[PDB]
Structure 1
């Protein structure tokens, strides 16, 4: 089951400037930063709240590491803004299989590595009324 909003994926040209904007404006601090070479991003997670399923909700700020990447292509076409939304689950493999069986395109056969060791997959935005939709299971199993 999808039990939380895990994060909002926000594309930006300059991660350090955008991180500072969120700190200065709202007082949101950096929970974690990393580079995901497979996905072609440098990201920062800003934790906003904890959630009733034992997880948390973050802003995920993403700058591209290369133009030939999902985020690099999208920023070139659309400029900075919301790129995707992510829902959390205790079993991304099972939820992804159930959604595949409804005819929504699941982009990965098998979940891939995401932020902080998470396992992630995506649903095609053209099957989700224009919203690129991520499904994520956190690496650290959570206590509701």
Structure 2
């Protein structure tokens, strides 16, 4: 089951400048930063709250590592702004299979590595009323 909003993926041209914007404006601090070379992003997670399923909700700020990437292409076409939304689950493999069986395009056969060792997959935005939709299971198992 999808039991939380895990994060909002926000694309930006300059991660350091956008991180400072969120710190100066709202007081949000950096929980974690990492580079994902497969996905072509440098990212910062800003924790906003904990959630009733034992997880948490973040802003995921993303700058591209290369123009030929999902985020690099998107920023070139659309400018900075919301890129994707992510739902958390205790079993992304099972939820992804159930959604595949409804005829929504699941982009990966098997979940791939995401932030902080998470396992992630994506649903095609044209099958989700225009919203790129991520499904994620955290590496550290959650206690509701």
Q: Place the TM-score, normalised by the shorter chain, in its bin.
A: over 0.9
Question: C-alpha displacement at 1:5, in angstroms?
Answer: 0.0
Question: C-alpha displacement at 1:119, in angstroms?
Answer: 0.1
Question: C-alpha displacement at 1:13, in angstroms?
Answer: 0.0
Instruction: Determine helix, strand or coil for the equivalent of 1:19.
Output: helix
Runs of 4+ more than 6 Å apart:
none
RMSD (CA atoms):
0.1
Q: Distance in 2 between matches of 1:129 and 1:21?
A: 30
Instruction: Provide structure 1 residue ranges, at least 5 long, that are not aligned to the other structure.
Output: none
Instruction: Determine helix, strand or coil for the equivalent of 1:22.
Output: helix
Deviations 1:103-131 (A, max 9, x none): 00000000000000000000000000000
Instruction: Provide structure 2 residue ranges, at least 5 long, that are not aligned to the other structure.
Output: none
Deviations 1:66-102 (A, max 9, x none): 0000000000000000000000000000000000000
Q: Distance in 2 between matches of 1:58 and 1:115?
A: 11
Q: Distance in 1 between matches of 2:6 and 2:133?
A: 11
Question: Number of aligned pairs?
Answer: 144
TM-score w.r.t. structure 1 length? 1.00
Q: Quote the residue 1:63 is aligned against.
A: 63
Deviations 1:43-86 (A, max 9, x none): 00000000000000000000000000000000000000000000
Deviations 1:3-57 (A, max 9, x none): 0000000000000000000000000000000000000000000000000000000
Instruction: Determine helix, strand or coil for the equivalent of 1:62.
Output: strand
Question: C-alpha displacement at 1:134, in angstroms?
Answer: 0.0
Q: Distance in 2 between matches of 1:108 and 1:31?
A: 27
Instruction: Determine helix, strand or coil for the equivalent of 1:67.
Output: coil
Q: Distance in 1 between matches of 2:3 and 2:135?
A: 11
